[PDB]
C-alpha cells in the first residue's frame, strides 16, 4: 500500500532517488533514500552542559572546590582517574592534581603567582584534608603523629 | 595493513597512515552514496515452502 | 503535526487537559489572543443564566521544567462550535493533535 | 561539555571551544598581558579579559599553542580513558573528539560528556606530551593488538573503493598509476573497473 | 603472586614463634641468618594463599588497607599494636601528597632512599 | 584556446511572478557543469536583498505579550512580518508605517506607500484583528543586506540606543532561496556538438533574473582576478609619556640624563639592587623616586618583552 | 605585585590595619612603630602605601576623607569640566563645605 | 607542535628520564640565563628543549658538566 | 598496587613450563602467543641430542618463536613473575614487554596497576548463570604411563586412574588428550 | 558590507620540485573555497592546451600481440612509456618524428630526430628498454594539437594526454580575520608533467575561466 501510495503522487516506488553533491555538482551513484521523518528536540541542551573554572570559592572544611556547578564549582578527579595516572606513571601530574589544584592552601597562591610571573613551578606542601583527618582521629582516644 | 606498517616502518609513518586512511575512507564513503531501503533486504521465496 | 501517526494523538491531546475544550457551546461571539467567549444556544441552555461561556487562556507561564506553556485560539468569529470541540492549542498541540 | 565529532582533526588534536578556553587559561592570559605591556596592573588585566577584546583573543591563541590538555571520559576503566591532545580553538560549545580515539574512549556521540584538565607545571606538560599523548598510545597494554583501527564509515568507504565488478566503464585501460585519479575524477572509468593494468613502483 | 604471600611456619628457626609472616621478610631473614652466622637454624615455612579481600588487609602499612574495606577494626588493631607506616606504597604517598614511587617520581624516591641511608 | 566560442545570455523566460528560467548560448564540453555549479553556489550564497530588521509598535512592550482585539500573538506578528517581501530604491534603511482599524484582515496593501518602497505581494497577512475598537499601529524598518543575520549579531551595535518596546527580528536578506540547473546538448546544430545550460531559479519577486545572474558573474570574476596574478611567494604600551613631570627634585634629572634613561618604561623595568649600581643618589632620593613611580605603576612593576622606537 | 620582602611586610601590616569602610585606622607613625625598624622611614612607608592606594577599590587605605576623594579626582580624566574647581574645594575647604 | 617523541626517547633510553632531563633544561630556558642551542621556530621552551635533546645535544651528562663549569667559574 | 619494577635481574632459573593448551577437540591456544613476550630460561634444548636453539636469557622478539615452532617444541621453561626472588617488587627480566612499546619493560613502571586494570576492564561477562571418542587426524596412542593388565579379549586392561592419551601426526605436536577412566579397553 | 567581498592576499606558494607546488590562500568568504577550488580543478583537468603523442606505427604487425625480435620489452609497455613523454611544438598542428639507434641498450629521448619546433623537456626518458644486440628499430611516432584528453578507444592509437598536468587536488580549511572564524582557506597542490610551471598553469586556467565568464557580465565594471 505504501508503494501504491507513492505511485499516486508520481514518485519512484522504490523509495530511492538520485541526489547531487552541493559542493562539486557530481551525482552520487547508488541512489539515496530521502523522506520525511518526525524529529523531536530533547531536553539535553549544550547551553546547560558546558561549565569551566580556573579558581573560585572553596569549602570551609577540607578547602576544596565546591562541586557540580554549585556556584561555579570544580570537577572531580577520582580513584579510577588516579589509577589511570599511576598506570601512565604520571607522578608530577598526580602530585599537581593532589596539592596545587586542591586543598594545599599555601600552595595554590604560590602557583598562581608563579604562573602569572611566567615561572611554571610547583611548591607541593601538604593537603589540608590530611590535617583534618589527623585532627578527627585525635578527637578519639588514639594518638597519631608524623615522625622525622 | 596498519599493523604491518607499524611493525615495518615505525611510529611516525603509521600515525600518518592512520590519518590518511581515515581521510580517504570518509571521503569515498560519502562519494559512494551508500543508502538503505526496504527493497535492499530481500526475503527468500522458499521461506513459505520451508515454513 | 506528524504526517505519519497512529490516531492516538487526538485522544492524548484531548484527555491531557492541556487544551481548552468547549463545553455546551453553540457559536462564538468574540475571539482574542487571550479570551474566547461562546454564545451557548438555547437547546443546551437552562433558565436562570445569561448564556455566555468565557475561557481565559494561559499565556506564557513557567512550567515545572522552566519551559513555556502557551495556549493559542483556533476558532474565528461566527464559527459554530459543538460540544467537546477544542478551542485553544496548548504546548505542542496542533488543532487538537499531539504535535511534539 | 558534550562530545562532538571532528573529522578534519588529526591524532594529536582536539577541538576546544573558545568559550571554555579563556577561562581555563585565565592566569596565563594575565601573565601574557602583563609581559607584553598591554595592562600595567592586575585590575586592568582583569577588566580587559572580562571585556573579551581582540588583543585578548590573539593572546589566547598565542598562549594555547604548544600546550597539551587532557580529556577524560566519565567511566574510566583502563589506562586509555585519559589521553592528552593539542587544543584547537573552535567557535562553538562542544568538544570535538577524534573518531579514531573514540574507540579507546568508548564514546558514542549521543549525549556523552567529557572532562578537561590542564597541566601547568613544566614537568606536567612534558609528561602529557611524552607519556599520555594520543600519538603514543598505539598498542593496547592488555594484549598487544593496536588500539587504533578504522571501524565505521571508513571501512565501508575503503571496501567500496577497493572492489571488482566486471564490464565496468573502461575495462581494458592501461596506465601508469598517477592517472587513475585523473581518470575517475574527470571521465572514462569507474573506481570499480576490472582488468586495469597499472605499473606500480 | 600478590595472592601467594603471608607464609606460616611450623619450625621455630630462631625467627619467631608466631604465625602470619610475609614470604619476602622470612626469606630475607633466612638468607641473612643461615649463610652469614648459623646455617643450621633453618625456619621451614608453609605458603598459605589468601583471597583478594584478605590479602588486601594483610599489609604492613596501616595507612593503606584502612581505606580499602574497614577503618574501625584496622585503626583499633594499629592503635593497640603501636605500628608505623613508613609510606612505602602508592596509596600512602598519594594520601600524604608526595611523589609516588613509580614512573617519573621513581628517581626522586630512589635518591631520597639513598640519602636517608647516610642522613 | 582554439576558438572557445564562448556563451551569450539569450532567451530569458518568466514562467511566473516568482519563477524564471534563463538560458545560455551553447558552450564547450565540460564547461556547463562547472559554470552551473559555480553560479548556483554564488546565487545561493551571496545575493543582496531587503528584509525587515526591527519593528516598533506602540501598544506592546515585549514580544511575549498579546494585544487586545488582535487574534495572533506578537510572535506571530513578527514571524509574519519576517516573510514580507519588499524591494527598495537607491537609499537603504527605510522606515514605513502601518495603521489600520476595523475587523478585517490587515494585509501588506494597506501600508503607507512611499516613492522608494514597492510591495511585491500585497496579499500577505499581518495577523488580522477581531474587535471593532481595536487599532494596530507600528513602524517597520527595512534595510538591505547579503546573508542571514540573527538578532544577536546586531546587539553589540546598540547599547544606549535600545528603548523599551523596540523589538528586533532576524534578517534573511536572501531573495533566491531555491535554484536548479540542467545542461543539455542542443541549439548548436549548425556547429559541432556542444552543450547549453538552462537555469531554473525561483525567487520571491524582489530581484530580476538577469540582474541576479550578472551580479553572480561579476562576483565570480572579481574573486577569480586574485588568481590571475600569483605573487607574494598598532599594539604598544599605553604608558609612553615622556620623562617630564616626574618631580625631579635635585639630581634625579641629572642621573636620568647621564644614564640615557628612556621616557618611562625602561625606568619602570628596573630592580632596586641593579638601580644601586647607578651613581649614588641617596636612600631618601631613591625612596622618593620610588614613591613617585609607584603612585602610577605599582612600585616599578613591569617586565616588558619588546620596546618599539 | 612586585614588592621586595621589606615592602611586602610593610604592605601586609598596612592592609592589616584597614577597616571595612576602607580607611586605615592607625596613623602612619603608629605603623612605623609597629614595624619597629631603624632603617624603615616615613618616606618608605608612604611610598608603599601610595603604591597600594591604586588598588581595585580606589581611594582605599586613605588616612582620612581629605585624601580619599582627591585620589579619585586625580584619577578621572582631565576632559570633564569643573575638575579644577572640585580640586580647589576639596583641597583645603573641607570645613567650608561641611558647615 | 611536535607530533611524536621517539628520537629523544631513543637518545635518552628510559622513557622517564627524558621527562626529567627535558624539564630541567626547559627550566633553564624559561627562568632565563640560557640560550637555545637549536634555532627556535616560535616554539615553547618545552618543545625547544625536547628537540635539542632529539638532535643529540643535551643529556643528563652535558647539563651537569655545564652546570659544574659555570659554578666553578664563579 | 604495591608491585613495581625495582630490579633488573633476580639471578634465578626457576619458572613455569609453558605448553599449548591441548584439551577437547583441538588446541585452543598454540605456543605462539603464550610465549611471544617472555624471556626463557636455560632449559631450551633442540630435539636433537647435544644441540641448542637459543641461549638462556633471550627475548623472543619476533622470530625466535618462529624457530621454536619450526623445531616443533611443545614445552619451554620460562621465568615468570612468581618465580622472581626479588625482595620487593619484581625484576625486569621476567616480564617482557606487553605494552605500547616493542622493548623490555623499564624499571619504575607500575605493573601492579597496569595489570588488574586490564583484567577488570572486560566487564562484558554474563549473569544469571568414556565411549564417545572422535579423532581429528592421524595420531598415535601415547598412553602416558598407563598400567597395562591382562584383559579377557585381545587387549590390555587398565588399572590406574590417571590415564591420558595424545595424538602424534608428524612431530611432538599433539591434537587432543581424551582422558579416560580405568574401564577403557585398548581397541588399537 | 553591501557588496564588499574579501580578496585573498596571502598567496604564498612553496614548491618541493620544479613540477610540484603547494599553493595557499588567505581567508576567503564562507563557502567560496569549494567554489573556486572545484572550478579550477575541473577546468584545468578537463580543458587545457597542450601537445601529446597520439599514435605510433612500429615496423612489424599492427596487432598488439607482437613479438620481441630483440626489444625484450612488450609493445604495450613501449606505448605506456611513450605516453609519459612531454613534447612541446610551436604552432604546428601535426608533425611526424622517428628515431634510429644502435644496440648498446639505453634508449633515451635524444635518439629521436631533432626538429625545429619539436622539443623534449628531458632527454633521459626511456622509450625503449635495453636491447639485446645491435639490431635497430624505427618508431615513426607522430604528435598533434589538442585540449583535455580523449581515450584511444574512440579517438585513435595509444592515447591522447593533451592536458599538461599530472595530479590536481585541493583542500579547504578554516580561518579567521579578527573575530569570525567562519572563513575558508583554499589549499591547492598540483603536479605538472613539465614544460609548464605549476603557477603558470594555475594562471592559465584562471585566465581561461575569467575570459570564459566575462562574456556573461556584458561589459560590467566600466569604471
Which has the closest alpha carbon to J58: J43, J71, J47? J71
- Residues J122-158 as b/e (b if ≥16 CB within 10 A, e otherwise) read eeebebbbebeeeeebebebbbbbbbbbbeeeeeeeb
CATH code that applies to domain H1-74: 3.90.940.10
Query: What are the chain C neighbours of F69 within 8 Å (beta carbons)?
Result: 32
Which has the closest alpha carbon to I5: E92, A93, H14? H14
CB F51 within 8 Å of CB F184:
no
Report phi then psi at E24, rounded to 5: -65, -45
Please answer yes or no on whether D43 and G55 come within 8 Å at the CB atom.
Answer: yes
What single DSSP character describes residue J111? Answer: G
**What count of CB pairs under 8 Å joins E to H?**
8
Chains in contact with E, counting 3 or more C-beta pairs less than 8 Å apart as contact: A, D, H, I
Assigned CATH topology for domain F1-48+174-232: Gyrase A; domain 2 (3.30.1360)
CA distance B40 to chain A (A): 10
Which has the closest alpha carbon to F40: J40, A25, J44, J28? A25
Please answer yes or no on whether H20 and E106 come within 8 Å at the CB atom.
Answer: no
Please answer yes or no on whether A40 and C4 come within 8 Å at the CB atom.
Answer: no
- Interface-testing mutation among H9, H18, H19, H26, with chain A (most A C-beta atoms within 10 A): H19
Please answer yes or no on whether H31 and A119 come within 8 Å at the CB atom.
Answer: yes
Cell of E5: 604471600
Chains in contact with C, counting 3 or more C-beta pairs less than 8 Å apart as contact: A, F
Please answer yes or no on whether D160 and B24 come within 8 Å at the CB atom.
Answer: no
Distance between the two ends of chain A, CA-based, in angstroms?
87
**Residue with cell string 609607584:** F294
User: D and B: touch, per 3+ CB pairs < 8 A?
Assistant: yes
Q: Does D123 touch chain E (CB under 8 A)?
A: yes
Please answer yes or no on whether E94 and A98 come within 8 Å at the CB atom.
Answer: yes
Q: What are the extents of the domains in chain J? A: 2-49+163-221, 50-162
Which has the closest alpha carbon to F116: F150, F100, F81, F92? F92
Q: Does I108 touch chain H (CB under 8 A)?
A: yes
Q: What is the DSSP string of H15-73?
A: SSHHHHHHHHHHHHHHHSS---SS---S--HHHHHHHHHHHT---TTHHHHHHHHHHHH
Please answer yes or no on whether F130 and C77 come within 8 Å at the CB atom.
Answer: yes
Please answer yes or no on whether I2 and E27 come within 8 Å at the CB atom.
Answer: no
User: Which range marks the domain in which residue C38 is found?
Assistant: 18-92
C-alpha–C-alpha distance, residues H70 and I8, integer Å: 36
- Residues F18-51 as b/e (b if ≥16 CB within 10 A, e otherwise) read bebbbbbbbbbbbbbbbbbbbbbbbbbbbbbbbb
What single DSSP character describes residue C34? Answer: S
CB A54 within 8 Å of CB D121:
no
Q: Which residues contact J151 (CB under 8 A, 6 or more apart)?
A: D170, D173, D188, J159, J160
Nearest CB among I99, I120, I123 relative to D141 is that of I99
- CA J164 to the chain's CA centroid: 2
Which has the closest alpha carbon to J210: F223, F25, F209? F223
Q: Does C65 touch chain A (CB under 8 A)?
A: yes
Q: What CATH superfamily classification does F233-309 receive?
A: 5' to 3' exonuclease, C-terminal subdomain (1.10.150.20)
Interface residues of chain D, partner chain G, Cβ below 8 Å: 41-43
CA distance E103 to chain H (A): 7
I65 labeled part of a ligand binding site: no
- CA-nearest residue to C65 within chain A is A43
Q: What CATH superfamily classification does J50-162 receive?
A: DNA-directed RNA polymerase, insert domain (2.170.120.12)
Q: Does A79 touch chain I (CB under 8 A)?
A: no
- Interface-testing mutation among G2, G56, G71, with chain F (most F C-beta atoms within 10 A): G2
What single DSSP character describes residue C43? Answer: G
C-alpha–C-alpha distance, residues D14 and D69, integer Å: 9
CATH of the structural domain F49-173, one choice from 2.170.120.12, 2.40.340.10, 2.40.100.10, 3.10.129.10: 2.170.120.12
C-alpha–C-alpha distance, residues D128 and G92, integer Å: 63
Query: What are the chain D neighbours of B13 within 8 Å (beta carbons)?
Result: none
CB G42 within 8 Å of CB G77:
no
Distances (CA, A) of E56 to B34, C82, E65, I39, I108: 55, 77, 6, 30, 22
What single DSSP character describes residue F64? Answer: T
Report phi then psi at C89, rounded to 5: -120, 115
Q: Which residues contact E75 (CB under 8 A, 6 or more apart)?
A: A137, A142, E62, E66
Query: What are the chain B neighbours of A21 within 8 Å (beta carbons)?
Result: 31
CA distance F255 to chain G (A): 20
Q: Does B24 touch chain D (CB under 8 A)?
A: yes
C-alpha–C-alpha distance, residues F259 and D102, integer Å: 63
Q: Which residues contact I168 (CB under 8 A, 6 or more apart)?
A: I139, I140, I142, I174
What's this structure's resolution in Å?
Answer: 3.5
Q: Are F1-48+174-232 and F49-173 the same fold in CATH?
A: no
Query: What are the chain E neighbours of A98 within 8 Å (beta carbons)?
Result: 94, 97
Nearest CB among A82, A89, A92 relative to E102 is that of A89
Distance between the two ends of chain C, CA-based, in angstroms?
8
Q: Does E106 touch chain A (CB under 8 A)?
A: yes
User: E and F: touch, per 3+ CB pairs < 8 A?
Assistant: no
Please answer yes or no on whether D170 and J151 come within 8 Å at the CB atom.
Answer: yes
CA distance D44 to chain G (A): 9
Query: What are the chain A neighbours of H17 within 8 Å (beta carbons)?
Result: none
Tell me how crowded residue D131 is: count the other CB atoms within 10 A of its CB: 22
C-alpha–C-alpha distance, residues D12 and C15, integer Å: 56
Query: What are the chain D neighbours of E104 within 8 Å (beta carbons)?
Result: 123, 127
Looking only at the bridges linking them, the beta strands covering I90-91 and I5-7 are: parallel
For residue D70, the SS3 value is strand
Chains in contact with D, counting 3 or more C-beta pairs less than 8 Å apart as contact: A, B, E, F, G, H, I, J
User: Which residue numbers come right before each break in chain F (C to N over 2.5 Å)?
Assistant: 233
C-alpha–C-alpha distance, residues G99 and J186, integer Å: 75
**Binding-site positions of D:** 108, 110, 112
CB C87 within 8 Å of CB C75:
yes
C-alpha–C-alpha distance, residues J87 and J83, integer Å: 10
Which has the closest alpha carbon to E3: E46, E44, E56? E56
C-alpha–C-alpha distance, residues F121 and F126, integer Å: 12
The domain that contains C41 carries what CATH number? 2.40.50.100
Please answer yes or no on whether B35 and A16 come within 8 Å at the CB atom.
Answer: yes
Which of D 79-108 lie inside 8 A of J, CB atoms?
Answer: 89-91
- Residues G74-98 as b/e (b if ≥16 CB within 10 A, e otherwise) read eeeeeeeeeeeeeeeebeeeeeeee
CATH code that applies to domain J2-49+163-221: 3.30.1360.10
Q: Does H17 touch chain E (CB under 8 A)?
A: yes
- CA-nearest residue to I108 within chain H is H16
User: J and E: touch, per 3+ CB pairs < 8 A?
Assistant: no
Please answer yes or no on whether C65 and A43 come within 8 Å at the CB atom.
Answer: yes
Q: Does B29 touch chain D (CB under 8 A)?
A: yes
Query: What are the chain G neighbours of F296 within 8 Å (beta carbons)?
Result: 54
For residue B19, the SS3 value is helix
Report phi then psi at F211, rounded to 5: -60, -45
Q: Does D188 touch chain J (CB under 8 A)?
A: yes
Q: Give the H or E element holding residue C98.
A: strand C97-98
Q: In whole angstroms, how large is the CA radius of gyration of chain C?
A: 15
Amino acid at each position: 500500500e505504501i508503494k501504491e501510495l507513492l505511485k499516486l503522487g508520481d514518485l519512484p516506488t522504490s523509495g530511492q532517488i538520485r541526489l547531487y553533491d552541493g559542493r562539486t555538482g557530481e551525482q552520487f551513484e547508488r541512489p539515496v533514500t530521502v523522506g520525511y521523518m518526525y524529529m523531536l528536540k530533547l531536553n539535553h541542551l549544550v547551553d546547560d552542559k558546558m561549565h569551566a573554572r580556573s579558581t573560585g570559592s572553596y569549602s570551609l572544611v577540607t578547602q576544596q572546590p565546591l562541586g557540580g556547578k554549585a556556584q561555579f564549582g570544580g570537577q572531580r578527579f577520582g580513584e579510577m582517574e588516579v589509577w589511570a595516572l599511576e598506570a601512565y606513571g604520571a607522578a608530577y601530574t598526580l602530585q599537581e592534581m593532589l596539592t596545587v589544584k586542591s586543598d594545599d592552601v599555601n600552595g595554590r597562591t604560590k602557583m598562581y603567582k608563579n604562573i602569572v610571573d611566567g615561572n611554571h613551578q610547583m611548591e607541593p606542601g601538604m593537603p589540608e584534608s590530611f590535617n583534618v583527618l589527623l585532627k578527627e582521629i585525635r578527637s578519639l582516644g588514639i594518638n597519631i603523629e608524623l615522625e622525622d | 595493513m596498519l599493523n604491518t606498517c607499524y611493525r615495518i616502518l615505525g611510529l611516525k609513518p603509521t600515525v600518518i597512515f592512520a590519518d590518511q586512511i581515515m581521510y580517504t575512507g570518509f571521503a569515498y564513503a560519502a562519494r559512494s552514496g551508500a543508502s538503505v531501503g526496504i527493497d535492499d533486504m530481500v526475503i527468500p521465496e522458499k521461506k513459505h515452502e520451508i515454513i | 503535526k506528524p504526517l505519519v501517526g497512529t490516531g492516538m494523538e487526538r485522544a492524548v491531546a484531548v484527555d491531557s487537559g492541556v487544551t481548552a475544550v468547549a463545553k455546551r457551546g453553540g457559536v462564538v461571539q468574540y475571539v482574542d489572543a487571550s479570551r474566547i467567549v461562546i454564545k451557548v444556544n438555547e437547546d443546551e441552555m437552562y433558565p436562570g443564566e445569561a448564556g455566555i461561556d468565557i475561557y481565559n487562556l494561559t499565556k506564557y507561564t513557567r512550567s515545572n521544567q522552566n519551559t513555556c506553556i502557551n495556549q493559542m485560539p483556533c476558532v474565528s468569529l461566527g464559527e459554530p462550535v459543538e460540544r467537546g470541540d477544542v478551542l485553544a492549542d496548548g504546548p505542542s498541540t496542533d488543532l487538537g493533535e499531539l504535535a511534539l | 561539555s558534550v562530545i562532538t565529532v571532528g573529522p578534519y582533526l588529526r591524532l594529536h588534536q582536539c577541538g576546544l571551544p573558545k568559550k571554555m578556553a579563556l577561562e581555563l587559561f585565565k592566569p596565563f592570559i594575565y601573565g601574557k598581558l602583563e609581559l607584553r605591556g598591554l595592562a600595567t596592573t592586575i585590575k586592568a588585566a582583569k577588566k580587559m579579559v572580562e571585556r573579551e577584546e581582540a588583543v585578548v583573543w590573539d593572546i589566547l591563541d598565542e598562549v594555547i599553542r604548544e600546550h597539551p590538555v587532557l580529556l577524560n571520559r566519565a567511566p574510566t576503566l583502563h589506562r586509555l580513558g585519559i589521553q592528552a591532545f593539542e587544543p584547537v580553538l573552535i567557535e562553538g560549545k562542544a568538544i570535538q573528539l577524534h573518531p579514531l580515539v573514540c574507540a579507546a574512549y568508548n564514546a558514542d556521540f549521543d549525549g556523552d560528556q567529557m572532562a578537561v584538565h590542564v597541566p601547568l607545571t613544566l614537568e606536567a606538560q612534558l609528561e602529557a606530551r611524552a607519556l599520555m599523548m594520543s600519538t603514543n598510545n598505539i598498542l593496547s597494554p592488555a594484549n598487544g593488538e593496536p588500539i587504533i583501527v578504522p571501524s565505521q564509515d571508513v571501512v565501508l568507504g575503503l571496501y567500496y573503493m577497493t572492489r571488482d565488478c566486471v564490464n565496468a566503464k573502461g575495462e581494458g585501460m592501461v596506465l601508469t598509476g598517477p592517472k587513475e585519479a585523473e581518470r575517475l575524477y574527470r571521465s572514462g572509468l569507474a573506481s570499480l573497473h576490472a582488468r586495469v593494468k597499472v605499473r606500480i613502483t | 603472586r600478590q595472592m601467594l604471600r603471608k607464609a606460616t611456619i611450623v619450625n621455630a628457626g630462631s625467627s619467631d614463634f608466631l604465625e602470619g609472616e610475609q614470604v619476602e621478610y622470612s626469606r630475607v631473614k633466612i638468607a641473612n641468618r643461615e649463610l652469614e652466622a648459623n646455617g643450621k637454624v633453618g625456619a621451614t615455612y608453609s605458603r598459605d594463599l589468601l583471597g583478594i579481600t584478605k590479602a588486601s588487609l594483610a599489609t604492613e602499612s596501616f595507612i593503606s588497607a584502612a581505606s580499602f574495606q574497614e577503618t574501625t577494626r584496622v585503626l583499633t588493631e594499629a592503635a593497640v599494636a603501636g605500628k608505623r607506616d613508613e609510606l612505602r606504597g602508592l596509596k600512602e604517598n598519594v594520601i600524604v601528597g608526595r611523589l609516588i614511587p613509580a614512573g617519573t617520581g621513581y628517581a626522586y624516591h630512589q635518591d631520597r632512599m639513598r640519602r636517608r641511608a647516610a642522613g | 584556446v582554439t576558438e572557445f566560442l564562448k556563451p551569450r545570455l539569450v532567451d530569458i523566460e518568466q514562467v511566473s511572478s516568482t519563477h524564471a528560467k534563463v538560458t545560455l548560448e551553447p558552450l564547450e564540453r565540460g564547461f556547463g557543469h562547472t559554470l552551473g555549479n559555480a553560479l548556483r553556489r554564488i546565487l545561493l550564497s551571496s545575493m543582496p536583498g531587503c528584509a525587515v530588521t526591527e519593528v516598533e509598535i506602540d501598544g506592546v512592550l515585549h514580544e511575549y505579550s498579546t494585544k487586545e482585539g488582535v487574534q495572533e500573538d506578537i510572535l506571530e506578528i513578527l514571524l509574519n512580518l519576517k516573510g514580507l517581501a519588499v524591494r527598495v530604491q537607491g537609499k537603504d534603511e527605510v522606515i514605513l508605517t502601518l495603521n489600520k482599524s476595523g475587523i478585517g484582515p490587515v494585509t501588506a496593501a494597506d501600508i503607507t506607500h512611499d516613492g522608494d518602497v514597492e510591495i511585491v505581494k500585497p496579499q500577505h497577512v499581518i495577523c488580522h484583528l477581531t474587535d471593532e475598537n481595536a487599532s494596530i499601529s507600528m513602524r517597520i524598518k527595512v534595510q538591505r543586506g547579503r546573508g542571514y543575520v540573527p538578532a544577536s549579531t546586531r546587539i553589540h551595535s546598540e547599547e544606549d540606543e535600545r528603548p523599551i518596546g523596540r523589538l528586533l527580528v532576524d534578517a534573511c536578506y536572501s531573495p533566491v532561496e531555491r535554484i536548479a540547473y540542467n545542461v543539455e546538448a542542443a541549439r548548436v546544430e549548425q556547429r559541432t556538438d556542444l552543450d547549453k545550460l538552462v537555469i531554473e531559479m525561483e525567487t520571491n519577486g524582489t530581484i530580476d533574473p538577469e540582474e541576479a545572474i550578472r551580479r553572480a558573474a561579476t562576483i565570480l570574476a572579481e574573486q577569480l582576478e586574485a588568481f590571475v596574478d600569483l605573487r607574494d611567494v598598532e599594539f604598544d604600551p599605553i604608558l609612553l609619556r615622556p620623562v617630564d613631570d616626574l618631580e625631579l627634585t635635585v639630581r634625579s634629572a641629572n642621573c636620568l640624563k647621564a644614564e640615557a634613561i628612556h621616557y618611562i618604561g625602561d625606568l619602570v623595568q628596573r630592580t632596586e639592587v641593579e638601580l644601586l649600581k647607578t651613581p649614588n643618589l641617596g636612600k631618601k632620593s631613591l625612596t622618593e623616586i620610588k614613591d613617585v613611580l609607584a603612585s602610577r605603576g605599582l612600585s616599578l612593576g613591569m617586565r616588558l618583552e619588546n620596546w618599539p622606537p | 605585585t612586585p614588592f621586595t620582602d621589606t615592602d611586602r611586610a610593610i604592605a601586609t601590616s598596612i592592609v592589616d590595619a584597614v577597616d571595612d569602610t576602607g580607611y586605615l585606622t592607625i596613623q602612619i607613625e603608629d605603623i612605623v612603630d609597629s614595624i619597629g625598624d631603624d632603617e624603615i622611614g616615613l618616606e618608605e612607608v608612604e611610598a608603599v602605601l601610595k603604591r597600594i592606594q591604586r588598588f581595585d577599590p580606589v581611594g582605599v587605605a586613605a588616612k582620612d576623607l581629605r585624601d580619599c576623594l582627591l585620589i579619585q579626582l586625580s584619577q578621572f580624566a582631565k576632559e570633564t569640566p569643573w575638575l579644577e574647581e572640585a580640586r580647589l574645594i576639596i583641597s583645603d575647604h573641607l570645613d567650608l563645605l561641611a558647615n | 607542535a611536535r607530533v611524536t617523541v621517539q628520537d629523544a626517547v631513543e637518545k635518552i633510553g628510559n622513557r622517564f628520564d627524558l621527562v626529567l632531563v627535558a624539564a630541567r633544561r626547559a627550566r633553564q630556558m624559561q627562568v632565563g640565563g640560557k640560550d637555545p642551542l637549536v634555532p627556535e621556530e616560535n616554539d615553547k621552551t618545552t618543545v625547544i628543549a625536547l628537540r635539542e635533546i632529539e638532535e643529540g645535544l643535551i643529556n643528563n651528562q652535558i647539563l651537569d658538566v655545564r652546570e659544574r663549569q659555570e659554578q666553578q667559574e664563579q | 598496587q604495591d608491585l613495581v619494577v625495582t630490579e633488573d635481574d633476580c639471578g634465578t632459573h626457576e619458572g613455569i613450563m609453558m605448553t599449548p593448551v591441548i584439551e577437547g577437540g583441538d588446541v585452543k591456544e598454540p605456543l605462539r602467543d603464550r610465549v611471544l613476550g617472555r624471556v626463557t630460561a636455560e632449559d631450551v634444548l633442540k630435539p636433537g641430542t647435544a644441540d641448542i636453539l637459543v641461549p638462556r636469557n633471550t627475548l623472543l622478539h619476533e622470530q625466535w618463536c618462529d624457530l621454536l615452532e619450526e623445531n616443533s617444541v611443545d614445552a619451554v621453561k620460562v621465568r615468570s613473575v612468581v618465580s622472581c626472588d626479588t625482595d620487593f617488587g619484581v625484576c625486569a627480566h621476567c616480564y617482557g614487554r606487553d605494552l605500547a612499546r616493542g622493548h623490555i619493560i623499564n624499571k619504575g613502571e607500575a605493573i601492579g596497576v597496569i595489570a588488574a586494570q586490564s583484567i577488570g576492564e572486560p566487564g562484558t561477562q554474563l549473569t544469571m548463570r568414556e565411549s564417545s571418542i572422535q579423532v581429528k587426524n592421524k595420531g598415535s596412542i601415547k598412553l602416558s604411563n598407563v598400567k597395562s593388565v591382562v584383559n579377557s579379549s585381545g587387549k590390555l586392561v587398565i588399572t590406574s586412574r590417571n590415564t591420558e592419551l595424545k595424538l602424534i601426526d608428524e612431530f611432538g605436536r599433539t591434537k587432543e588428550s581424551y582422558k579416560v577412566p580405568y574401564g577403557a579397553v585398548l581397541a588399537k
